[PDB]
Design an enzyme around this catalytic site. Structure first.
Site, short mmCIF file in Angstrom:
data_model
loop_
_atom_site.label_atom_id
_atom_site.label_comp_id
_atom_site.label_asym_id
_atom_site.label_seq_id
_atom_site.Cartn_x
_atom_site.Cartn_y
_atom_site.Cartn_z
N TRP A 168 3.95 -8.33 -18.19
CA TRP A 168 2.98 -9.02 -17.31
C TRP A 168 1.89 -8.04 -16.85
O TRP A 168 0.68 -8.34 -16.91
CB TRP A 168 3.66 -9.63 -16.11
CG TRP A 168 2.74 -10.34 -15.13
CD1 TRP A 168 2.19 -11.59 -15.27
CD2 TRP A 168 2.26 -9.84 -13.87
NE1 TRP A 168 1.39 -11.89 -14.17
CE2 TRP A 168 1.43 -10.84 -13.29
CE3 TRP A 168 2.45 -8.64 -13.17
CZ2 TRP A 168 0.84 -10.69 -12.05
CZ3 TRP A 168 1.85 -8.49 -11.93
CH2 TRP A 168 1.07 -9.52 -11.38
N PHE A 208 11.36 -5.33 3.20
CA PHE A 208 10.12 -5.19 2.44
C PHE A 208 8.87 -5.43 3.33
O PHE A 208 7.94 -4.64 3.34
CB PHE A 208 10.16 -6.17 1.26
CG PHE A 208 8.81 -6.69 0.87
CD1 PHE A 208 7.90 -5.87 0.19
CD2 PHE A 208 8.45 -7.98 1.18
CE1 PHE A 208 6.62 -6.34 -0.13
CE2 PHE A 208 7.17 -8.46 0.84
CZ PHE A 208 6.28 -7.65 0.18
N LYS A 222 12.33 -4.14 -4.11
CA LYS A 222 13.46 -4.03 -5.05
C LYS A 222 14.69 -4.87 -4.62
O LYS A 222 15.24 -5.64 -5.43
CB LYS A 222 13.92 -2.58 -5.23
CG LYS A 222 15.25 -2.48 -6.03
CD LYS A 222 15.06 -2.87 -7.50
CE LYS A 222 16.41 -2.71 -8.25
NZ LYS A 222 17.39 -3.79 -7.85
N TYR A 254 10.36 -11.95 -14.90
CA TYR A 254 11.32 -11.20 -14.12
C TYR A 254 12.69 -11.82 -14.23
O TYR A 254 13.67 -11.11 -14.30
CB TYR A 254 10.95 -11.18 -12.62
CG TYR A 254 10.33 -9.86 -12.15
CD1 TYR A 254 11.07 -8.93 -11.40
CD2 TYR A 254 9.02 -9.54 -12.46
CE1 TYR A 254 10.51 -7.76 -10.96
CE2 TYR A 254 8.43 -8.34 -12.02
CZ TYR A 254 9.19 -7.46 -11.27
OH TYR A 254 8.64 -6.27 -10.83
C1 LIG Z 1 5.79 -5.22 -8.74
C2 LIG Z 1 5.60 -6.68 -9.07
C3 LIG Z 1 4.55 -7.18 -10.00
C4 LIG Z 1 6.26 -7.72 -8.68
C5 LIG Z 1 7.36 -8.11 -7.80
C6 LIG Z 1 6.76 -9.52 -7.54
C7 LIG Z 1 6.63 -9.68 -6.03
C8 LIG Z 1 5.59 -10.54 -5.34
C9 LIG Z 1 7.54 -9.00 -5.33
C10 LIG Z 1 7.61 -9.07 -3.82
C11 LIG Z 1 7.29 -7.68 -3.32
C12 LIG Z 1 5.86 -7.39 -3.67
C13 LIG Z 1 4.76 -8.16 -2.97
C14 LIG Z 1 5.60 -6.46 -4.60
C15 LIG Z 1 4.20 -6.13 -5.03
S1 LIG Z 1 3.95 -4.36 -5.26
P1 LIG Z 1 1.93 -4.21 -5.11
O1 LIG Z 1 1.46 -4.54 -3.75
O2 LIG Z 1 1.61 -2.83 -5.55
O3 LIG Z 1 1.44 -5.29 -6.22
P2 LIG Z 1 -0.07 -5.31 -6.71
O4 LIG Z 1 -0.24 -4.01 -7.45
O5 LIG Z 1 -0.93 -5.47 -5.48
O6 LIG Z 1 -0.20 -6.50 -7.65
#
Ligand SMILES: CC(C)=CCC/C(C)=C/CC/C(C)=C/CSP(=O)(O)OP(=O)(O)O
Ligand SMILES: CC(C)=CCC/C(C)=C/CC/C(C)=C/CSP(=O)(O)OP(=O)(O)O
Ligand SMILES: [Mg+2]
Ligand SMILES: [Mg+2]
Ligand SMILES: [Mg+2]
Ligand SMILES: [Mg+2]
Ligand SMILES: [Mg+2]
Ligand SMILES: [Mg+2]
Lengths: 304, 304
Positions: free
Chosen positions: B295, B140, B168, B54
């Site tokens: 990823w 969030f 986001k 990221y």
């Molecule tokens: C979208 C992504 C890989 C990453 C951003 C990384 C992170 C931890 C961002 C913080 C906000 C979160 C927890 C997003 C996960 S979407 P979700 O709950 O749908 O993720 P999951 O599908 O359970 O792995």
């Protein structure tokens, strides 16, 4: 706009040149066109050609009835764009008793007598099958001026409404009439899911190709009759992309509905449920989807 | 599942292995994992790897903060699946004042002291930029347990909500902190549309790849905490197609958002509005998109 791959082979009725000449010629004598430009544009649309692509296995002595009906409905569909919902509804409602044969037409009004004479001739050929097309036509007519057009719709709600506004059910009954294909109420009930899927494909393929025409209409015609009501605008708004991008995405979804049509047909056969009539019928729907697309891609109605 | 072509090429932070060991190691020491199978699954996910994909241009001495923050948010995201909405909301709300540094953690509870120590350490490194990540994180967190997840949504309404549930804004603030990339309020206002488009791509790419995991959770975990809330299911419902068909259509839409990102960035530059900080930022967003996808395609979190 490059269409994604399809496994469907469109087919066209073998009498399309003769029937188009006959039917275009009838409308050029009887219908009131506002000028020469409009008369040429009428012939350029190829309304008997779309009919022959929709119903390539119609009986030779029946295909002309279908061409006449879809031609008059297309001409009306355009006229409604210059009307309010209330005006359009009055216009259509006048034609309903005339279509049933209950009320005589005013012979100085071409839409009235064209409609009256057409349905009289259909009943004279096959009363039972002609009658089965009436309520589906009326359902479509009433959808065309439904105020729900001026309300926000999401994709799912739109497709459910569009099934009426696109004339899915009238097209099914007209297909059966033109082929003399009789199905029992049990056979009809069995293919409801297949019909609902096919409707989405007809609607969205139409929306993709007719978008520019409809955009122009929405800017120049009546604020109600000309209103833009299309999956292209809905997906562009929901997804925040251009109309052009929305078309590319919608075309992929159309191929997913083609795949689903195949799986639904397979499942009908794999349960104990396919009859000879039902096989002819679901194959007929396939021709509607591919024929609709082939016409849409070639017709000057959408490209100019 | 064949991803359609993309012109975005991902990049990974040079220190990903050593930082992964440091951060995996801290959580393995501190976090209350229930058993060895869970510890192995945690390492298998590659949470620092997704962080380094990221934010591949993070400063070398700041990337570990971002890995720690994302790693703890992932662990919590999984914990909430076994909770009701009420339980999840209570769980997140307790961490909010702790994250601010306003309430001291109970040091017998790892999530509290991990959260507290992390944010204290980020404020010690860069106070102003750390503070800028707080409200986006809380927005969030509050989205994660919002009852709107249990009510019908259309595609547009879902993408709007999902911008919060996918983090986001926090990912944007974290990216900036990780790079020491300071932008003025006016600069940030100029790229609002670019941020909104990027959110849709991150969200939907995650939805496509994490579908099988989320489907399984929905059937086995808490009926609220584990509820299916994803564009794969919403599009499947709107269009009446299978999940696999919806993923195909959604992937095409993701490539449309990539095209739009490129056009928006080109316009920003053409209008003379692309400052050096904004050029770094929008390229940063492109890495989030491609990094998220690489990823997602490869993590054991989604394939087992
Ligand atoms: C979208 C992504 C890989 C990453 C951003 C990384 C992170 C931890 C961002 C913080 C906000 C979160 C927890 C997003 C996960 S979407 P979700 O709950 O749908 O993720 P999951 O599908 O359970 O792995
Ligand atoms: C869908 C199709 C080509 C054909 C079926 C042929 C006909 C006349 C069917 C009767 C129902 C109507 C008028 C559908 C036009 S949908 P529309 O009003 O969106 O058509 P337009 O885009 O104005 O050509
Ligand atoms: Mg029309
Ligand atoms: Mg119409
Ligand atoms: Mg149309
Ligand atoms: Mg999750
Ligand atoms: Mg989540
Ligand atoms: Mg997910």
């Amino acid at each position: 706009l490059e269409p994604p791959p399809s496994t469907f082979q469109p087919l066209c009725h073998p009498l399309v040149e003769e029937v188009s000449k006959e039917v275009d010629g009838y409308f050029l004598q009887h219908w009131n066109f506002p000028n020469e430009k409009a008369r040429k544009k009428f012939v350029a649309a190829g309304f008997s050609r779309v009919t022959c692509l929709y119903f390539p296995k119609a009986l030779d002595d029946r295909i002309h009835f279908a061409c006449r009906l879809l031609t008059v409905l297309f001409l009306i569909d355009d006229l409604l764009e210059y009307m309010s919902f209330e005006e359009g509804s009055a216009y259509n409602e006048k034609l309903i008793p005339i279509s049933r044969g209950d009320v005589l037409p005013d012979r100085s009004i071409p839409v009235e007598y064209i409609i009256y004479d057409l349905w009289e001739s259909m009943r004279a050929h096959d009363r039972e099958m002609a009658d089965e097309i009436l309520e589906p036509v009326f359902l479509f007519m009433r959808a065309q001026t439904d105020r729900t057009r001026a309300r926000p719709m999401g994709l799912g709600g739109y497709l459910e409404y569009r099934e009426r506004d696109v004339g899915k059910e009238l097209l099914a009954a007209l297909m059966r009439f033109s082929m003399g294909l009789k199905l029992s109420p049990s056979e009809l009930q069995r293919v409801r899911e297949i019909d609902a899927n096919c409707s989405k494909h007809l609607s969205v393929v139409n929306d993709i190709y007719s978008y520019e025409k409809e955009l122009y209409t929405s800017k120049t015609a009546h604020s109600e009759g000309g209103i833009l009501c299309t999956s292209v605008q809905i997906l562009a708004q929901e997804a925040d992309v251009t109309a052009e991008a929305a078309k590319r995405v919608l075309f992929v979804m159309c191929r997913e509905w083609e795949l689903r049509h195949q799986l639904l047909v397979a499942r009908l056969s794999a349960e104990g449920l396919e009859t000879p009539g039902l096989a002819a019928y679901v194959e007929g729907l396939e021709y509607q989807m591919s024929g609709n697309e082939l016409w849409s891609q070639t017709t000057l109605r959408y490209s100019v």
